[PDB]
Amino acid sequence: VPRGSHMVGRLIYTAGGYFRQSLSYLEAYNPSNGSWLRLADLQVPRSGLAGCVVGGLLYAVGGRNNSPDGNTDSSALDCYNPMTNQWSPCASMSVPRNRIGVGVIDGHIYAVGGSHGCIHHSSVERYEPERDEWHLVAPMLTRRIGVGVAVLNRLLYAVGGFDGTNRLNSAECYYPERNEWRMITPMNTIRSGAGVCVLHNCIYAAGGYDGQDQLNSVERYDVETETWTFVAPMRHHRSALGITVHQGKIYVLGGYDGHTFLDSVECYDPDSDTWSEVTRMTSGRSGVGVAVTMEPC
Numbered sequence: 399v400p401r402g403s404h405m406v407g408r409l410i411y412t413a414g415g416y417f418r419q420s421l422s423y424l425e426a427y428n429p430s431n432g433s434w435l436r437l438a439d440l441q442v443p444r445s446g447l448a449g450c451v452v453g454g455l456l457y458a459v460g461g462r463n464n465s466p467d468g469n470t471d472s473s474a475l476d477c478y479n480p481m482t483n484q485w486s487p488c489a490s491m492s493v494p495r496n497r498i499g500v501g502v503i504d505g506h507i508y509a510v511g512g513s514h515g516c517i518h519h520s521s522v523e524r525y526e527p528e529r530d531e532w533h534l535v536a537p538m539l540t541r542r543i544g545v546g547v548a549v550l551n552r553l554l555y556a557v558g559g560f561d562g563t564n565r566l567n568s569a570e571c572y573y574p575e576r577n578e579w580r581m582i583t584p585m586n587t588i589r590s591g592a593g594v595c596v597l598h599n600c601i602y603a604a605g606g607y608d609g610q611d612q613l614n615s616v617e618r619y620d621v622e623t624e625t626w627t628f629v630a631p632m633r634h635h636r637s638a639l640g641i642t643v644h645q646g647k648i649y650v651l652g653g654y655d656g657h658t659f660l661d662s663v664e665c666y667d668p669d670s671d672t673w674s675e676v677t678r679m680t681s682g683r684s685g686v687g688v689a690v691t692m693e694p695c
């Protein structure tokens with residue numbers, strides 16, 4: 399469960415992010431010993447990207463390079479191999495997607511929503527690593543940027559976000575065999591840029607922005623009861639946070655609290671319904687991509 403491949407543990411990788419400008423950092427945190435490693439920079443700076451892992455490879459998807467010399471939304475898919483410590487371009491998406499949400503089903507990467515200039519996407523596309531090919535699938539019922547995405551029981555959920563006019567509490571679910579999206583129970587809070595993940599049988603939505611404050615509240619959707627319930631709030635309000643699951647606990651990384659770009663990383667224990675601080679990143683940032691895979695070489 400803890401060991402992967404050769405004889406190694408798994409790390410929490412954070413890629414990219416934003417502080418003053420879009421960042422190229424790739425760093426990996428080890429919950430077993432508290433250590434941080436700096437790894438190979440992304441080829442192109444990006445905030446607002448998502449991260450995921452397939453076959454042990456780390457993928458960086460979408461985003462936007464906010465640089466003083468120009469701002470460029472990204473359709474880019476790039477893959478990091480922990481065994482070589484090298485980034486490799488993959489095929490690009492049909493469209494640039496900043497503030498994207500990503501989920502993995504059946505070894506396939508789903509890219510959801512996001513923005514391209516003043517365009518807010520409802521479009522969705524699926525990537526097949528064995529063929530290095532993107533194909534559009536059915537669009538969402540809602541245009542969503544800053545959308546959180548999670549996978550539960552081989553179904554993909556798109557949660558919260560912003561359609562261009564209002565921040566959203568709505569959420570919806572993709573059924574792959576019917577290529578069909580259906581709305582589900584909305585959250586009890588409007589959230590854009592929330593951290594969205596799955597733990598046991600629930601989809602969590604932590605933090606985000608409700609249109610006037612960054613949030614510390616956290617809720618989770620029990621798919622069996624189709625209801626949202628608040629759990630314990632985080633210790634920091636945060637928006638544009640990184641999130642992932644590691645050994646049964648939820649990790650939230652950085653974000654913006656309305657005053658500071660956070661370096662705080664918090665870990666949620668579901669058994670005790672408590673959050674603790676477990677480390678800080680090397681520097682404060684928002685809009686990172688986060689995933690978990692094997693230790694690098």
Ligand SMILES: CCOC(=O)/C=C/C(=O)O
Pocket residue numbers: 451452453454455504505
């Ligand atoms: C069917 C392909 O699935 C994978 O290769 C998954 C890898 C992973 O979750 O690391």
Ligand SMILES: CCOC(=O)/C=C\C(=O)O
Pocket residue numbers: 591607612637638654656
């Ligand atoms: C008021 C401009 O919009 C924001 O500033 C939105 C979110 C955030 O900081 O987290």
